[PDB]
Amino acid sequence: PHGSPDWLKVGLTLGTSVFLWIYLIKQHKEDVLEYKRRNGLE
Amino acid sequence: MNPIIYTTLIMTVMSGTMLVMISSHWLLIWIGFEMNLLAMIPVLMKNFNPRATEAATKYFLTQATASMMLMMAIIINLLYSGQWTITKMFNPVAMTMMTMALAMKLGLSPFHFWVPEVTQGISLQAGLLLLTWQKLAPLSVLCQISQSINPNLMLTMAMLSILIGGWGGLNQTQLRKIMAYSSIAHMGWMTAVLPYNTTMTILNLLIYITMTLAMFMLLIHSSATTTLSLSHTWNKMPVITSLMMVTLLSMGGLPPLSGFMPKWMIIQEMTKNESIIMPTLMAMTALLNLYFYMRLAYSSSLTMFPSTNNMKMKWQFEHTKQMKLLPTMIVLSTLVLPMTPALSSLN
Amino acid sequence: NVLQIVRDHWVHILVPVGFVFGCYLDRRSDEKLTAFRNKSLLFKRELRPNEEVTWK
Amino acid sequence: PPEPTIRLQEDPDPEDENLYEKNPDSHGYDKDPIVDLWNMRVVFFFGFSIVLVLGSTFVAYLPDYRMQEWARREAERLVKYREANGLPLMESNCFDPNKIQLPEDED
Amino acid sequence: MPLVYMNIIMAFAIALAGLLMYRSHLMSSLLCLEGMMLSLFIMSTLIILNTHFTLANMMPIILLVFAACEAALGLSLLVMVSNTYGTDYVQNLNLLQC
Amino acid sequence: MLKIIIPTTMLLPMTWMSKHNMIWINATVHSLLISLISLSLLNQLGENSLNFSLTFFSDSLSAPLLVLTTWLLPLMLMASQSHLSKETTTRKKLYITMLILLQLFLIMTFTATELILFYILFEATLVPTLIIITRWGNQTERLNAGLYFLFYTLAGSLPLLVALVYIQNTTGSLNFLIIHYWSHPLSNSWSNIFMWLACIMAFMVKMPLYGLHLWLPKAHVEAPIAGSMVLAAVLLKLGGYGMMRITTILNPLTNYMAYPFLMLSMWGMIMTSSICLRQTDLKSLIAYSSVSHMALVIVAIMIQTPWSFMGATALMIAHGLTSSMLFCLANTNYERVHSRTMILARGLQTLLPLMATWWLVASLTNLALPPSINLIGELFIITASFSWSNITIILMGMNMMITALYSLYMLITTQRGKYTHHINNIKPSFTRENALMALHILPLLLLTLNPKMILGPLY
Amino acid sequence: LQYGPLAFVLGERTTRKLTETSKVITVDGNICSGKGRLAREIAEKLGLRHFPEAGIHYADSTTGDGKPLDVQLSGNCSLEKFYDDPKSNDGNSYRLQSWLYASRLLQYADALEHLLSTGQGVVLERSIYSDFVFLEAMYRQGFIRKQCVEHYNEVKKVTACEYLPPHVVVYVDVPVPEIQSRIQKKGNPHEMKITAAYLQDIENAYKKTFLPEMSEKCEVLQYSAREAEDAEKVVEDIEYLKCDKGPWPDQDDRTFHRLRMLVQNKLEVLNYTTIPVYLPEITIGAHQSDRVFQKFTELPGRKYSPGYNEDVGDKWIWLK
Amino acid sequence: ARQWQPDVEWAEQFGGAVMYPTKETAHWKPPPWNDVDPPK
Amino acid sequence: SSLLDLIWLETILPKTTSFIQMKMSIMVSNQKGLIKLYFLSFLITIMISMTLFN
Numbered sequence A: 001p002h003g004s005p006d007w008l009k010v011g012l013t014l015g016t017s018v019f020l021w022i023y024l025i026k027q028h029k030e031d032v033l034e035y036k037r038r039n040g041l042e
Numbered sequence B: 001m002n003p004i005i006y007t008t009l010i011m012t013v014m015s016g017t018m019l020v021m022i023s024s025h026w027l028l029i030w031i032g033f034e035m036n037l038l039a040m041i042p043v044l045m046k047n048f049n050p051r052a053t054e055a056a057t058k059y060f061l062t063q064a065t066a067s068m069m070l071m072m073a074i075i076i077n078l079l080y081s082g083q084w085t086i087t088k089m090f091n092p093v094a095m096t097m098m099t100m101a102l103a104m105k106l107g108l109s110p111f112h113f114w115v116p117e118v119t120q121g122i123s124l125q126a127g128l129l130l131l132t133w134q135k136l137a138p139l140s141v142l143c144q145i146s147q148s149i150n151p152n153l154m155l156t157m158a159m160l161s162i163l164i165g166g167w168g169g170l171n172q173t174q175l176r177k178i179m180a181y182s183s184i185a186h187m188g189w190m191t192a193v194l195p196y197n198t199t200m201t202i203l204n205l206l207i208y209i210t211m212t213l214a215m216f217m218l219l220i221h222s223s224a225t226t227t228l229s230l231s232h233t234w235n236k237m238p239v240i241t242s243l244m245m246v247t248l249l250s251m252g253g254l255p256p257l258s259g260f261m262p263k264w265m266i267i268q269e270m271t272k273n274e275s276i277i278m279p280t281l282m283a284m285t286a287l288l289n290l291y292f293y294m295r296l297a298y299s300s301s302l303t304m305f306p307s308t309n310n311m312k313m314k315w316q317f318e319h320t321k322q323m324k325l326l327p328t329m330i331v332l333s334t335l336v337l338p339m340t341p342a343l344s345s346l347n
Numbered sequence C: 001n002v003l004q005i006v007r008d009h010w011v012h013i014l015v016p017v018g019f020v021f022g023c024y025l026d027r028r029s030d031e032k033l034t035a036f037r038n039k040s041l042l043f044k045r046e047l048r049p050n051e052e053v054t055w056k
Numbered sequence D: 001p002p003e004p005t006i007r008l009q010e011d012p013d014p015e016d017e018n019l020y021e022k023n024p025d026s027h028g029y030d031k032d033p034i035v036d037l038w039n040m041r042v043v044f045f046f047g048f049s050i051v052l053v054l055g056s057t058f059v060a061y062l063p064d065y066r067m068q069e070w071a072r073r074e075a076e077r078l079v080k081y082r083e084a085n086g087l088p089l090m091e092s093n094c095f096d097p098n099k100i101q102l103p104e105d106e107d
Numbered sequence E: 001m002p003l004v005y006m007n008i009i010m011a012f013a014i015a016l017a018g019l020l021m022y023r024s025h026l027m028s029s030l031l032c033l034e035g036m037m038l039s040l041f042i043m044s045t046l047i048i049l050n051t052h053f054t055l056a057n058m059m060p061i062i063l064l065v066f067a068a069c070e071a072a073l074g075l076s077l078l079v080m081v082s083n084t085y086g087t088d089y090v091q092n093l094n095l096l097q098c
Numbered sequence F: 001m002l003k004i005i006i007p008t009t010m011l012l013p014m015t016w017m018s019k020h021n022m023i024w025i026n027a028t029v030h031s032l033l034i035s036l037i038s039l040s041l042l043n044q045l046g047e048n049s050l051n052f053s054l055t056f057f058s059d060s061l062s063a064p065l066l067v068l069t070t071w072l073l074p075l076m077l078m079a080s081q082s083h084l085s086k087e088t089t090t091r092k093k094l095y096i097t098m099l100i101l102l103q104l105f106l107i108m109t110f111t112a113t114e115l116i117l118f119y120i121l122f123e124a125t126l127v128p129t130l131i132i133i134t135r136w137g138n139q140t141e142r143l144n145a146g147l148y149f150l151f152y153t154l155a156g157s158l159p160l161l162v163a164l165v166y167i168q169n170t171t172g173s174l175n176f177l178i179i180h181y182w183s184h185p186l187s188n189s190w191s192n193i194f195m196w197l198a199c200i201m202a203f204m205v206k207m208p209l210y211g212l213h214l215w216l217p218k219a220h221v222e223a224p225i226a227g228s229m230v231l232a233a234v235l236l237k238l239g240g241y242g243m244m245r246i247t248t249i250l251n252p253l254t255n256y257m258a259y260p261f262l263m264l265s266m267w268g269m270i271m272t273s274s275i276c277l278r279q280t281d282l283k284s285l286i287a288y289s290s291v292s293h294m295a296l297v298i299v300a301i302m303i304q305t306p307w308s309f310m311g312a313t314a315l316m317i318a319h320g321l322t323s324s325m326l327f328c329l330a331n332t333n334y335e336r337v338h339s340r341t342m343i344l345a346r347g348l349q350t351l352l353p354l355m356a357t358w359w360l361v362a363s364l365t366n367l368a369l370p371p372s373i374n375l376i377g378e379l380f381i382i383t384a385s386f387s388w389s390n391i392t393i394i395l396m397g398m399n400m401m402i403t404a405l406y407s408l409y410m411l412i413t414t415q416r417g418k419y420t421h422h423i424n425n426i427k428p429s430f431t432r433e434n435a436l437m438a439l440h441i442l443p444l445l446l447l448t449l450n451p452k453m454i455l456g457p458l459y
Numbered sequence G: 001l002q003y004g005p006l007a008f009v010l011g012e013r014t015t016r017k018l019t020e021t022s023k024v025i026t027v028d029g030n031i032c033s034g035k036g037r038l039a040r041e042i043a044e045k046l047g048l049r050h051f052p053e054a055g056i057h058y059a060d061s062t063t064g065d066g067k068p069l070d071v072q073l074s075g076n077c078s079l080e081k082f083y084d085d086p087k088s089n090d091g092n093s094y095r096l097q098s099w100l101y102a103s104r105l106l107q108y109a110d111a112l113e114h115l116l117s118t119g120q121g122v123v124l125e126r127s128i129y130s131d132f133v134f135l136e137a138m139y140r141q142g143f144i145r146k147q148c149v150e151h152y153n154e155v156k157k158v159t160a161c162e163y164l165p166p167h168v169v170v171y172v173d174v175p176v177p178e179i180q181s182r183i184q185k186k187g188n189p190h191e192m193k194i195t196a197a198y199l200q201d202i203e204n205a206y207k208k209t210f211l212p213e214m215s216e217k218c219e220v221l222q223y224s225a226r227e228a229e230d231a232e233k234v235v236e237d238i239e240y241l242k243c244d245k246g247p248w249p250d251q252d253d254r255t256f257h258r259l260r261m262l263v264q265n266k267l268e269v270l271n272y273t274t275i276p277v278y279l280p281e282i283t284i285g286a287h288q289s290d291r292v293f294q295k296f297t298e299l300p301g302r303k304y305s306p307g308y309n310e311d312v313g314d315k316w317i318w319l320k
Numbered sequence H: 001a002r003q004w005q006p007d008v009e010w011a012e013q014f015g016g017a018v019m020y021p022t023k024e025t026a027h028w029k030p031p032p033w034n035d036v037d038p039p040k
Numbered sequence I: 001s002s003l004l005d006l007i008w009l010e011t012i013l014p015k016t017t018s019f020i021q022m023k024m025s026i027m028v029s030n031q032k033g034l035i036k037l038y039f040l041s042f043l044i045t046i047m048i049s050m051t052l053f054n
């Protein structure tokens, strides 16, 4: 019809994507650190 | 019906399936089956017409007979060993009773006769539910007791199901009957690997559910239940017909599509057990399913059928309601072959 | 004209870029197959004074 | 029989269109003369000039990774050595018999 | 396994065969399922009482209840079919075919 | 090998992000550049192979096929430019996408260090060809043709898969290098006989074998020009390549099991060459000629001697080029006359002299005139067969005679005589068609200067 | 919140919107008559919403911009040609009849949507009911074939079996001599050629079949030309009678929810208007269909969804 | 000059109740367009 | 051209397969929709299954 870009939905979509990416980067960092500590590499 | 009542009935069906999946007592599994059957009938009769009532009564008769047979198997197993836990049966007769009850619930040949008629009678959404969600509980029970099954009987019913589905799909113009025969053939493929590997059974089930969901949602989007009605879709939604053709190619087991993953794996598994003849016959018979999928593709997207004049008006309108998971279902049903080793997740 | 024909000829650059990326990926995959470098009986060679690896 | 004999509403079969009609010097690539000319030019330059000539010259001057001259030189020095020492040129055994252990039959 | 158990089992088998016959009168089909469940109740009760398994004294009643609920639904279905044809004949349900 | 695969993949977004009137130019230019890049695979070794990675490896049997596959795409685009003029941009982009996907699958198939990966890609090539045939074909028989081209293939290919997995369950691997190095003899057993059949029949059906060749005339006649070109040039050679790869595990059982296929091929070459003499359709005649040439290649592979393998490789390359050229000539006639009946348009030498020269050179290469690579492969196979048995010379010479007969019959019927009077729409040949013909024929006469590039790994 | 099951669940109910004034009504009259004037006058007097009689390009007025499209893209039929040469070889008569029936179905769906969503009643000219009379006329004059009437009956059954008929029907009675005199007085050259047999056959259909069948399930107000001039009496007649014999009082809140879901989503309303029955007057070949569909797509605001058309002037496309 | 596309006669092959009609199944009828039968 | 290629090679592999699959499909899919016959077959199969295996 005749509707504006719903900035609530846009903001929620961007926020979900950014939160997921930040969470993934963090999770990878502690995954690497935990693996290194457990296997006695560094 | 009322949306509240519809949601309650859908959650009751899911709770029955869940009750079957999480319980360790045979009585609770039987209760879950009863709950699922009780809540499933109004879903099949959501749109009132004589055909839907006939489909619902046939489905009820079949499922109630299967439930009585299953309870007979449970009681005989209790008689020969006072056990209620779902595990190896310990009785030869009880296992056969259980196998026939679960084959009747699944629709495996020679208990297949109800599936095409029930699917034709009910609507497309009811058929989607019946062909996707209603296979989880019997297959889960079969997986739990796979060490008990006689391989001869299970493999006989699997090969019979594949043959019957392949032959019965060749004679159909109705899309719902085609889906029903396809489901019978896929159930036959699923149950032939239970004696050897339940992981392959689950992988085949997941791939089949994905493809069936995609195909049913495409059929609902382009609201067609016959071949000739589907032949008109290119004149309004050619992209839908293209997606449907790719999905049909995947359902026929062609590489590099997703539908090649199960059969391949299943064949591979069956070769590790020195079973060569049976997978060969299964593939040769699946060629029939591919033939009628290809006929549908010819009639839908690879050729342009004549249209009517009123179609012009349909050019001016767009769908109000959309399926959110349809693109994901299409992609997962066509392009997941490179991710095959992920089956180690014991899906 | 710059900033105008780019919007009409941007597609042309893609194939050449792919060729470079494929070469880079081929070298990167080569770097994972060095388990026998300077170890084959045919080409056991003593390294030059200012050499690290016989081949890359 | 009031039937029209017209089985359906159909467009008539169009007649084929000549590219030479609206454009002599048409090169048979496109009905747009500019795109036609540039398609001809790119096909001729990248097909006849680049691939056909430069690729053929590149194939002609490929280095001897098949080792034809290497094998010829090896055979030349080997024949020179055996002829000088009176050895019987090629031997009939491909491997030395002393290092093969046959199974004793005792039949 | 004594003779009473085999008698109840053959009663269940007779009821199942009678259901699978379908002469006519879908009401008779419901009656055959009903005899099947009655035989199941009798034999489960005998097994549970004989072995003195105190807790499963629950499950016969439960079985009855659930089966009885099923019966209700079947009756409804039968009734509705009759509302379309005026009779509960089996042969009227041939609109859907293989 | 990724330096060739990645640009072929990038051909797709470039095609779909192109202007409506630049798709042909961009596709042709970048496909030609990909061909030029792939031309550097020809630098092969006298030793094992070009083992790029665990997944892809190159060989002097694979390299000529790869180069021909990369070279065929620009010619297919040039041939398709004409008859797709009146069609929408999205559908033309889809057609080019199908061609690009076919090239990608063929490229990955020819390297394919794994036998299961080879099977997957070798069957993945089926889908684009079927869509091209059943979507952009003209007559009503195309659908039927597609069905044949489908099921025959699968009827051969489904047992092979089973055999393949069976081998890996016993050997432990399906890597071609490990298979070659760890090969063991096959005992004369019924189980081994059926394993042999499951390994062979899939590649036999796509050559095609004489008894199993029914799908080829339909598929090649009802396909569009690009489809016919790719079917005759590259897709027929998949069976030969697969047999050359797979016969390493079938010894010594090949000695006994080769007899029925050898008889079928030796008699079917005569049968199909004779069929060519009585043909009312140009495309069907060219298809039957392809069947005869592939019968000769089957004989060569079954004999499994060094000269046999060299001749088979040379003949596969030469036949691909010659058959593509012949199909292009037939299509140039068809787009003018719209009939595809050989007897209808006559005496075209007086109206199209340069096209008559192209017809003559194509017939000469099909006739296997020395020192063309067609005759190089022919003669190597014939000499190997003569060493196999001196009586093969009768059948081989008869095939040569009939081949010359039907090639010159095809040339004389269409080019010589008197022009048909009522046909007045024979327009002068376009620069596109002449360029296509030259781009077919110069590679052949230029490959006759360096034969070792197409003589395979046993050179 | 676009209306759906969730709106029904939370608050949205239409039984509270019905204020005994809705009264979906329709007006039936002979070709060239006061039914249009009477329908409008009823619409202003009763506070209802008037729906002008559906034409060839009624659907064009509700989609995109309201301006009509070309004849080749909308309808592929013309009333002027039907009047000029009703026995045409290309089957314009039945194509016109089918397109008009589909337009009336769409307009009835729109009227029902408005009434159920707002509670305000509507006034209509010839609806999906009584659209058959012209068909019968065309059959009795020989303008169309029989297979046309079976196809029309099939489509009409499958479509009209799912909507509620109007509360009261208003019929304006006009004799044929005076109808022809009024036709001649308009001055339309194409309407000049309507034969009196066609008008008489059309008149016969309304009285013989249409009046008794709507009398038994609805309420009927037979008016003449003189008594249709004063709308006060007609409005008083509408107010005095109370609809208690039709299916409307038997409707309830869930059936209203189902009907409101049906009236939206116009694709499902028009679903059975294109059933695969191959009548030469209406079936279209693949080549012509493809060409016309391509032409329709190239229209300014018709390539994409309404909010995603740059050439029209939609902005923020890459964020919608 | 024009690619063949299915006509009405080609389409009517797929319009029956089942494919491959037989003497016994000749009298079968396709289901209604909407899955509703007249109550008679 | 005619006896072998157009007739007998067609008769052997493709036409025979098509005919056999056609007949089998006709036999399989031709049930009148009467659940009496269905459940009679169910009894038959159930009876056969119990006896053959054990």
Ligand SMILES: CCCCCCCCCCCCCCCCC[C@@H](O)O[C@H](CO[C@H](O)CCCCCCCCCCCCCCC)COP(=O)(O)OCC[N+](C)(C)C
Binding pocket: B199, B202, B203, B206, B207, B210, B332, B333, B336, B339, B340, B341, B342, B343, B345, B346, B347
């Ligand atoms: C065709 C694509 C299908 C995709 C499937 C749907 C994707 C969406 C699913 C959403 C997330 C699912 C994760 C669930 C969270 C917790 C998982 C946990 O509860 O279950 C565990 C296990 O979770 C599942 O096993 C993992 C599911 C992952 C499925 C992916 C494999 C599919 C094959 C590869 C195809 C490519 C798909 C990837 C592209 C998306 C433990 O199971 P367990 O209680 O101990 O035993 C039950 C199973 N048994 C009986 C077989 C042993």
Ligand SMILES: CCCCCCCCCCCCCCCCC[C@@H](O)O[C@H](CO[C@H](O)CCCCCCCCCCCCCCC)COP(=O)(O)OCC[N+](C)(C)C
Binding pocket: D051, D052, D055, D056, D057, D059, D060, D061, D062, F035, F039, F064, F067, F068, F071, F317, F443, F446, F447, F449, F450
């Ligand atoms: C119009 C009338 C005629 C006018 C023109 C007159 C001139 C004619 C002269 C040309 C033809 C006469 C033949 C004489 C040949 C001279 C050149 C030849 O001797 O060089 C060849 C060299 O050429 C190459 O060998 C052949 C070219 C390879 C062709 C590659 C094809 C191009 C790619 C296109 C795509 C592929 C499509 C097909 C897929 C398989 C062979 O040389 P060779 O003794 O050996 O070694 C080369 C030099 N070394 C010693 C340093 C190594």
Ligand SMILES: CCCCCCCCCCCCCCCCC[C@@H](O)O[C@H](CO[C@H](O)CCCCCCCCCCCCCCC)COP(=O)(O)OCC[N+](C)(C)C
Binding pocket: F188, F189, F190, F193, F209, F210, F211, F212, F257, F260, F261
């Ligand atoms: C139709 C278009 C072409 C399609 C492809 C055709 C090619 C397929 C041909 C198959 C190759 C040969 C098959 C079997 C070869 C075995 C050798 C046999 O022929 O000789 C005798 C075999 O004897 C008899 O043949 C026994 C079998 C008799 C039954 C066979 C049926 C005869 C005609 C069937 C042909 C139909 C082919 C198509 C089937 C659909 C020797 O007897 P013996 O030395 O003691 O045992 C040798 C085998 N051992 C050592 C493993 C034990």
Ligand SMILES: CCCCCCCC/C=C\CCCCCCCC(=O)O[C@H](COC(=O)CCCCCCC/C=C/CCCCCCCC)COP(=O)(O)OCCN
Binding pocket: B274, B275, B276, B277, B280, F152, F155, F156, F159, F162, F163, F166, F190, F191, F192, F194, F195, F196, F197, F198, F201, F205, F212
């Ligand atoms: C163009 C259409 C052609 C259709 C296919 C043609 C090829 C047919 C080849 C046979 C198909 C299946 C063969 C099995 C695949 C290989 C597996 C294998 O070799 O294992 C064998 C298994 O061998 C078999 O099981 C073979 C059974 C074959 C059954 C199907 C017969 C199909 C038709 C037979 C007659 C025709 C045969 C040649 C036809 C050529 C094509 C015309 C031995 O393993 P084990 O038994 O575990 O170890 C021995 C100790 N127990």
Ligand SMILES: Nc1ncnc2c1ncn2[C@@H]1O[C@H](COP(=O)(O)OP(=O)(O)O)[C@@H](O)[C@H]1O
Binding pocket: G030, G031, G032, G033, G036, G053, G079, G097, G100, G101, G126, G131, G134, G135, G191
């Ligand atoms: N279902 C139909 N079939 C044929 N013609 C129709 C149909 N519906 C409307 N028309 C045409 O619409 C025209 C205008 O309708 P009408 O009410 O009679 O005139 P006016 O708009 O001036 O009041 C008429 O000429 C009539 O024939």
